[PDB]
Ligand SMILES: O=C(N[C@@H]1[C@@H](O)[C@H](O)[C@@H](CO)O[C@H]1O)C(F)(F)F
């Protein structure tokens with residue numbers, strides 16, 4: 001079993017089981033992780049087999065992630081608790097108050113993460129920290145709430161729940177996707193002060209409380225930089241690293257030539273580039289790829305490794321407390 | 335004032351007032367209409383001035399459109415009634431019944447269209463006819479409902495409201511965007527279902543709206559491999575064989591946003607697939623490239639298809655109607671659904 005450092009590329013796979021070609025691709029030193037999608041899911045036992053064979057290829061084991069946010073963003077349905085959209089939690093906040101909403105968010109996080117942890121998944125790319133300005137359809141009900149305080153608090157409560165389930169968090173989409181219209185490269189014309197007073201606050205607060213990663217917005221904020229955030233040294237190095245003090249992973253979000261697109265991502269401050277639905281572009285990228293110097297990469301990947309062992313998860317899922325959490329969360333979704 | 339037929343390209347503009355270069359671009363015979371966005375809106379009076387100067391360039395007057403669906407898709411906010419998301423109408427359906435929901439949809443349509451008609455707008459790109467399968471975040475609350483019957487009936491009721499406000503309808507996104515997952519922004523999703531599955535559900539609102547006089551359709555940027563390997567907006571099977579021949583739709587088929595392989599070639603394959611009018615947004619450079627030496631494809635139905643979309647209310651008539659108590663009550667009712 002070859003020992004190769006996790007590379008800075010997160011790739012993906014076609015279907016339910018690895019092909020031989022995929023195995024060879026995943027052994028490339030450029031690759032450090034995998035993101036899964038609904039097309040990779042048949043049932044829980046198949047998923048376990050898939051994650052095991054991915055993990056068996058090399059050490060440190062490839063980090064495996066998925067988009068389980070809730071509502072209309074939940075890749076794996078059958079055999080999982082159906083998760084509510086995050087704005088459901090914000091509706092509880094408005095109706096029953098912060099305390100009930102936080103409690104509910106904790107349980108959603110716990111169920112979400114634990115069920116995925118049982119299947120060999122390391123991380124869900126959640127939570128969305130974008131504010132619901134009522135402008136952006138592609139975010140839509142994926143946002144907790146309009147109000148930064150509600151978003152921050154619900155996100156923190158979800159994060160604690162995720163940690164109980166073995167998982168770190170990934171805040172999306174830095175520095176805030178909520179204000180633009182999105183239904184192209186959108187433009188958010190606001191000033192940095194306007195963003196600091198609202199959209200950025202949940203990111204600051206989550207970073208302070210141990211958030212593992214961030215996904216950047218594919219959005220230009222011209223008053224701060226002419227470049228989209230995911231390609232901006234100002235956003236990623238000057239604001240996120242230096243000003244906010246964030247030490248976790250900065251993902252590039254989807255780059256899908258590719259070599260040049262990746263280069264500018266890394267140069268801007270991204271640790272890991274995502275290349276989804278395009279194994280051809282992954283093949284093009286990795287051929288003659290030089291791994292950029294990043295002494296923090298290894299630790300940044302490792303912080304995201306799932307913190308629960310397989311047996312410990314099986315035990316927790318047998319408890320009455322967890323099963324009650326499952327039924328509570330199921331009830332929010334219907 | 336030059337008399338030029340409306341061309342098959344729908345373009346756009348940069349900001350609040352036309353520049354001289356934009357005026358010259360909009361006189362090109364390749365162009366037949368304009369789509370507006372939030373960046374073109376400062377306030378109602380500026381908007382009126384903008385639409386007037388667009389219309390003054392040529393005859394037949396360039397058709398002007400905008401995306402006013404409701405909820406998180408409403409370009410012009412200040413000075414307009416805030417519109418509810420379409421799923422709010424589906425919630426009324428579930429709670430208070432079809433009759434109350436249809437009535438509400440009629441008022442939303444009326445307010446939506448009338449306020450835009452006051453400003454010189456011809457058409458809103460609405461309604462969404464996609465079904466809420468609980469899969470597609472980008473559609474999300476933009477869909478009326480999960481159930482094809484509810485979607486069809488709410489859409490028809492909205493359509494009658496729109497017509498009261500001077501406007502035709504544009505169904506989105508043919509043949510149905512509801513089932514794919516969509517929470518990236520720039521991927522090409524795949525809907526693996528069979529044609530029969532779509533006919534039993536997602537296609538039915540499109541059939542019904544077509545029969546009842548829907549003026550246009552926007553295609554889904556989605557591949558349905560069991561029917562064709564091409565995305566719907568570039569598929570002869572979807573657009574000619576299914577939409578034209580089988581469904582009998584006679585209105586406008588708009589293209590995807592074509593924004594390389596080159597714009598000329600991308601437009602060519604759109605027209606060849608069955609699109610009447612190509613959209614080229616946020617890229618006046620590509621519109622300039624496209625129109626230079628452009629040969630207008632032969633389409634004897636184009637002129638009538640554009641004209642069917644012209645606003646049916648005169649500007650003064652709309653200002654009068656908006657002073658009425660009945661319309662102001664509609665405004666307050668719709669405002670209340672949004673809050
Ligand atoms: O929102 C979506 N598509 C939008 C349309 O709704 C809109 O009328 C048109 C014009 O601006 O451009 C597309 O990008 C989709 F649901 F297809 F992703």
Ligand SMILES: O=C(N[C@@H]1[C@@H](O)[C@H](O)[C@@H](CO)O[C@H]1O)C(F)(F)F
Pocket residue numbers: 035067125138139172173177215216217218253254517518519
């Ligand atoms: O949804 C958006 N971006 C998504 C991320 O949320 C997601 O975690 C990632 C991995 O699948 O892929 C992006 O496209 C955006 F809002 F940025 F458009």
